[PDB]
């Protein structure tokens, strides 16, 4: 509504490759308090991947990508990036970026229901 999110970067790679995704936020970006990445594989629910707090840049990584993925953001450019290293076939999914403006305690950032705006997604395939 107030914020539009456009993901980019998805493509087909092979197991072991690296791939970087990005999302550009626009509209009423002054209010952003956190952004996150989720992913939806075939037949699975949307799964939490990573979140970043907007002012300080504190990061939260999901257990299944912890140690291989890195989330970062640029406040001046209103972007958030997901660096994915050592990819695996199980990482194949549509990757969605989300944004929140309400304040929060950290525990809620893992939940798909905690975000106010969502992008259309970008397809990642790992052979």
């Amino acid at each position: 509504a107030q914020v539009q999110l456009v993901e980019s970067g998805g493509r087909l790679v092979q197991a072991g490759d690296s791939l970087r995704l990005s999302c550009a936020a626009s509209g009423r970006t002054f209010s952003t308090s956190a952004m996150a990445w989720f992913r939806q594989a075939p037949g699975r629910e949307r799964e939490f991947v990573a979140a970043i707090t907007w002012t300080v840049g504190n990061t939260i990584l999901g257990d299944s990508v912890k140690g291989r993925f890195t989330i970062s953001r640029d406040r001046a450019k209103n972007t958030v990036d997901l660096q994915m290293d050592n990819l695996e076939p199980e990482d194949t999914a549509v990757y969605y970026c989300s944004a929140r403006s309400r304040g929060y305690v950290l525990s809620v950032l893992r939940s798909v229901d905690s975000y106010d705006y969502w992008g259309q997604g970008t397809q990642v395939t790992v052979s």
Partner: protein, 226 residues
């Protein structure tokens, strides 16, 4: 991303400072590249008088960011991904039964212009060999340039062998070993193994009195089915 800087015709400048067996020389070049077609058009001048080596031996040293990468391969184009900040390109070139060239170049944008600045040192050449004896034909052949990723250096390793035709009908091989590394710290693209199909044609400007080379090049990436 740097690929967007190559969607049209891009002006090029080249500068080379060389020293081969103690013979010092300088070359300047200018022209334009069009990576949409994979095409380069350049004219080079020896600004110090007579070039002390044959012009064909300098072709590889004198901008692979102008290669055409087909749509299905654009994620493997390291060269453009390093732009505008640029890359360092270093080579050792072994001329069979003769000396070697060592080169270090920086390739980067200065505004709208793609600049290639090079230092070259050659040693161990035979004073009566094909190079210092100017026995190479003034022409060039087609070659495949093999590229692989070098993850530890966040760049690429490149290898190929140039066939230089000699006036007596023989061929002089030049074994090329090449490394490219980004100058900046921004994200770059590390490729799967592939090659550049490269073609070059050398000519003269009949109105140019200085020692010079007109060069046209067509380069397209290949080797990945999809």
């Amino acid at each position: 991303k740097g690929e967007e800087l190559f969607t049209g015709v891009v002006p090029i400048l080249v500068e080379l400072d060389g020293d081969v067996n103690g013979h010092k020389f300088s070359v300047s070049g200018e022209g334009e590249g069009d990576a949409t077609y994979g095409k380069l058009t350049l004219k080079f001048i020896c600004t110090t008088g007579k070039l002390p080596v044959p012009w064909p031996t300098l072709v590889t040293t004198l901008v692979q960011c102008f290669s055409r990468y087909p749509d299905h391969m654009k994620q493997h184009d390291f060269f453009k991904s390093a732009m505008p900040e640029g890359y360092v390109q270093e080579r050792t070139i072994f001329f069979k039964d003769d000396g070697n060239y060592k080169t270090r170049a920086e390739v980067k944008f200065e505004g709208d212009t793609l600049v290639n600045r090079i230092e070259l040192k050659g040693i161990d050449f035979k004073e009566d060999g094909n190079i210092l004896g100017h026995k190479l034909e003034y022409n060039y052949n087609s070659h495949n340039v093999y590229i692989m990723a070098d993850k530890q250096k966040n760049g690429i390793k490149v290898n190929f062998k140039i066939r230089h035709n000699i006036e007596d009908g023989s061929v002089q091989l030049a074994d090329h070993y090449q490394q490219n590394t980004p100058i900046g710290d921004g994200p770059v693209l590390l490729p799967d193994n592939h090659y550049l199909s490269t073609q070059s044609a050398l000519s003269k400007d009949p109105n140019e009195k200085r020692d010079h080379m007109v060069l046209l090049e067509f380069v397209t990436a290949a080797g990945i089915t999809l």
